[PDB]
Design a protein around this nucleic acid. Structure first.
Ligand code: MET
Ligand SMILES: [Mg+2]
Lengths: 90, 252, 111, 365
RNA sequence: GCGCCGUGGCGCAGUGGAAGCGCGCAGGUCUCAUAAACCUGAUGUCCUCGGAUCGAAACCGAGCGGCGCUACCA
């Protein structure tokens, strides 16, 4: 048995200019990370960067203010659920 | 006033690994207090503070915080310390940290006694920490040895036995985990297990019930390594004593 | 200061005040929350009525008043067309709150 | 040791477990955020004021230590539309029951019915209906419900199945319930001489039905553990316990004693003659409706190569239909069934994701 | 009940004197402006309560919550 709802944290990270960054915390480690990053890069105008945390956690970077759009994209391309998302900041 | 150096001799040696608590930044670097050797002031000249150019000074070094360091220039006459942070090799760092920790622990030991009775601190230092160091190298090692088997305290006498007793108490029952997984599914299996436990627990510790097949006992340790010898005995009992019952038991 | 100080902002002068009178509804003109701020002067803005619409910036505010996401806005709907509509007046946050309190706009969206 | 096995069937949250708590005191532990999930268990002593629950008459009238009539046991089922498969299972141990309807909710509620007809189907004919939550209703409401009840209890087999309204929350009127259950749920004779046979529904546990076990007998469990085959497990009765008190022997009525593995297994005399079938001959009948859910859609006749839950004894097994005649179908099973006698069974189908009781019959060898 | 996390906010780690890292919010500084880049934070002593010992969040207990073991213990 596996938990259906895990806390995925889409945070506000301050990027160059008045612009921001979609940073994802608490990523499910089941699918290939690099592949997902590549997919994300392809779909938007973003660059994918992964910051590694020991034992559990990987910070996934996507340059820009999308949030909802990103979530929609994730929903469209299988690998991540609908309920797992949380917007953090404002 | 409380003072006196961490090690045996008054003055630091060349290429000695230290840990430095940052006081204030000036021009050369910082007038730091060396926490591996007394509290004598020295400096890290702006060239050997970091391996690479890091621009920021108050994030990689930080005022109030400790830094892994090495002593470069020493002048055995009055008191100067030319110091480095860069010359400390990869790894090595861990060792230095450990040493620092040991030193801190040693320091912690030597103040309670003073508090209890005043009397000159230098004398106290002489009669507790130095002879052992001279014999071996570091006081923490000596302490460890004592803990393992009490013989280093017999060498040089403490001011009173009370202090020694207190130290012993501080050092001291230590809980060691012992898990038993009995392969039983029968109705009268639990009872059998209990019976087995009662023949092994007696004559010397704290048995906790988690499940019918799983039983978790905590064994007491008086001198830290005394708990391993009891565990071994218990294990032996499982293989030798529990044979008349015919209950299959497994150890994790 | 307006946005970013600049050498090239002192040749403008803005006059409206924070303590300005709030504008009410008209005929062929109603209130919208902004769905998503689009490009090239276009903007996707869901009306408080119950129609999706496509909103468009018409002059005036094109450089003077900058806008963001999820804002209460006066939209004069096209009388001849319907799908394309135009933004007339941006409402302040305080202003929006006051409107909400009044109950002039339907209570469905948050500031 | 307890004489008899009384079941407490009924819809969900009508308070079945709560009524068990006003009668015995015992809770089923709970499940603590949900509700009863395993069959709950509890016992009690019934004495009577000639001149009760504890050897004490000085509660009403006066002192003369009430005379002990018997010690009974209950089986708290759950109530949830889906725990159907266990409650079925549980009935196999019952010697009678008590239908807890809720006084403040629409009388024939899905599970209430599902249960009721299960009862009239398996054979549990010694029934007492009970109107529970009357402590939260209008003195009119509880009588009109008594009407709908007195009217349901008509065409059906339920002549004078009395209906004793209670308050399981404030333990009110329970003593007239004890008088009902002291009249109508009589304690069946059981020839001991018979083959020692018993059903299992927990293990960390089960009920005897025919025969009697004694401390230190040699015993086996069927079908037992599997390999794919299924072999019997032998052991010696290390001990016998009812409630918290130990006994040297054990006889029908009551429950006796890892996770609950040998669930749906049975225990008999070592060196005894019982079939461990893989394929079985059921004779059978259907309901005309699917009484249970919260919709009454009419029962489709059995098509072969269909998967159906065969509830036999305490066990709950799944199986596929190889033969479809008038009232004799032949079934192929995943997990073997030890058929101790001739027997009763209960047959279900996955109607809309959740399984549903649809018909019954008799095992045949 | 056991084990770790017990915060100065989240998320990561370390045990006997030294306010531990990454992010976030709150605020500053630098630049005409924002971001990066920088510092300072907030319940003052790192679960609740007190003690042995000057002390400490760390040593010890009674008392709570999340999961790593249990399976409902008549
Ligand atoms: C649910 S097991 C049967 C009841 C028994 N008195 C115990 O408790
Ligand atoms: Mg001007």
């Amino acid at each position: 048995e596996t938990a259906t709802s895990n806390y995925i944290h889409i945070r506000i990270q301050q990027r160059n200019g008045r612009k921001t960054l979609t940073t994802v915390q608490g990523v499910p480690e089941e699918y290939d990370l690099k592949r997902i990053l590549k997919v994300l890069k392809k779909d938007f105008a973003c660059n994918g960067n992964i910051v590694k945390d020991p034992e559990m956690g990987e910070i996934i970077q996507l340059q820009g203010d999308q949030r909802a759009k990103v979530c929609e994209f994730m929903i469209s391309q299988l690998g991540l659920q609908k309920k797992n998302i949380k917007i953090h900041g404002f | 006033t409380s003072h006196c150096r961490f090690y045996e001799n008054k003055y630091p040696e060349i290429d000695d690994i230290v840990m430095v608590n940052v006081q204030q930044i000036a021009e050369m670097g910082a007038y730091v207090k060396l926490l591996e050797y007394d509290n004598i002031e020295g400096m890290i000249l702006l060239s050997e503070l970091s391996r690479r150019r890091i621009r920021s000074i108050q994030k990689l070094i930080r005022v109030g915080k400790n830094d892994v360091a090495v002593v470069l220039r020493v002048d055995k006459e009055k008191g100067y310390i030319d110091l480095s942070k860069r010359r400390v090799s990869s790894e090595d760092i861990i060792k230095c940290e450990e040493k620092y920790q040991k030193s801190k622990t040693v320091h912690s030991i030597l103040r309670y006694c003073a508090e209890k009775f005043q009397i000159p601190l230098e004398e106290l230092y002489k009669t507790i920490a130095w002879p052992l160091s001279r014999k071996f190298g570091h006081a923490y090692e000596a302490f460890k040895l004592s803990i393992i088997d009490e013989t280093v305290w017999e060498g040089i006498e403490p001011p009173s036995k009370d202090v020694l007793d207190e130290l012993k108490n501080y050092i001291s029952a230590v809980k060691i985990r012992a898990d038993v997984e009995v392969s039983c599914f029968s109705y009268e299996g639990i009872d059998a297990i209990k019976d087995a436990l009662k023949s092994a627990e007696d004559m010397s510790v704290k048995v906790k019930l988690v499940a019918a097949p799983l039983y978790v006992l905590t064994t007491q340790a008086l001198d830290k390594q005394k708990g391993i010898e009891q565990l071994e005995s218990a294990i032996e009992k499982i293989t030798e004593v529990i044979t008349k019952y015919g209950g299959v038991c497994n150890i994790t | 200061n307006t946005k970013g100080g600049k050498k090239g902002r002192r040749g403008k002068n803005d006059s409206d005040g924070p303590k300005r009178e709030l504008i009410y509804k008209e005929e062929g003109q109603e209130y919208a929350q902004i769905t998503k701020m689009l490009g090239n002067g276009r903007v996707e803005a869901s009306c408080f009525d119950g129609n999706k619409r496509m909103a468009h910036i018409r002059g005036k505010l094109r450089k003077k008043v900058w806008m963001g996401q999820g804002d209460i806005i006066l939209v004069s709907l096209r009388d001849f067309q319907d799908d394309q509509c135009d933004v007339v007046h941006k409402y302040n946050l305080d202003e929006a709150r006051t409107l909400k309190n009044q109950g002039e706009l339907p209570e469905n969206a948050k500031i | 040791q307890a004489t008899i096995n009384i079941g407490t069937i009924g819809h969900v949250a009508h308070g079945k477990s709560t009524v068990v708590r006003a009668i015995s005191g015992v809770q089923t532990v709970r499940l603590e955020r949900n509700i009863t999930i395993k069959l709950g268990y509890a016992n009690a002593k019934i004495y009577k004021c000639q001149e009760e629950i504890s050897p004490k008459c000085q509660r009403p009238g006066c002192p003369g230590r009430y005379k002990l009539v018997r010690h009974v046991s209950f089986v708290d089922c759950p109530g949830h539309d889906i725990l159907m498969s266990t409650m079925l299972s549980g009935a196999a141990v019952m010697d009678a029951a008590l239908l807890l309807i809720a006084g403040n909710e629409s009388c024939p509620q899905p599970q209430t019915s599902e249960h009721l007809a299960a009862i009239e189907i398996m054979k549990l004919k010694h029934v007492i209906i009970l109107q529970n939550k009357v402590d939260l209703m209008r003195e009119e409401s509880a009588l009109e419900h008594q009407k709908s009840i007195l009217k349901f209890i008509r065409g059906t087999i339920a002549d004078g199945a009395p209906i004793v309204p209670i308050s399981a929350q404030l333990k009110y009127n329970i003593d007239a319930v004890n008088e009902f259950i002291v009249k109508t749920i009589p304690v069946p004779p059981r020839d001991f001489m018979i083959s020692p046979r018993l059903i299992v529904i927990r293990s960390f546990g089960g009920s005897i039905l025919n025969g009697v076990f004694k401390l230190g007998d040699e015993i086996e469990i069927r079908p037992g553990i599997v390999t794919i085959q299924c072999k019997p497990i032998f052991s010696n009765i290390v001990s016998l316990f009812a409630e918290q008190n130990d006994l040297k022997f054990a006889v029908p009525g009551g429950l006796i004693g890892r996770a609950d593995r040998l669930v749906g297994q049975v225990v008999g005399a070592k060196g005894h003659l019982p079939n461990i079938y893989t394929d079985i001959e059921i004779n059978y009948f259907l309901l005309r409706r699917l009484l249970g859910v919260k919709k009454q859609a009419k029962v489709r006749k059995l098509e072969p190569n269909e998967v159906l839950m065969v509830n036999i004894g305490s066990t709950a097994t799944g199986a596929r239909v190889v033969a479809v005649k008038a009232d004799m179908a032949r079934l192929q099973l995943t997990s073997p069934a030890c058929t101790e006698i001739n027997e009763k069974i209960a047959l279900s189908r996955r109607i809309e994701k959740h399984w549903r009781l649809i018909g019954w019959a008799t095992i045949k060898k």
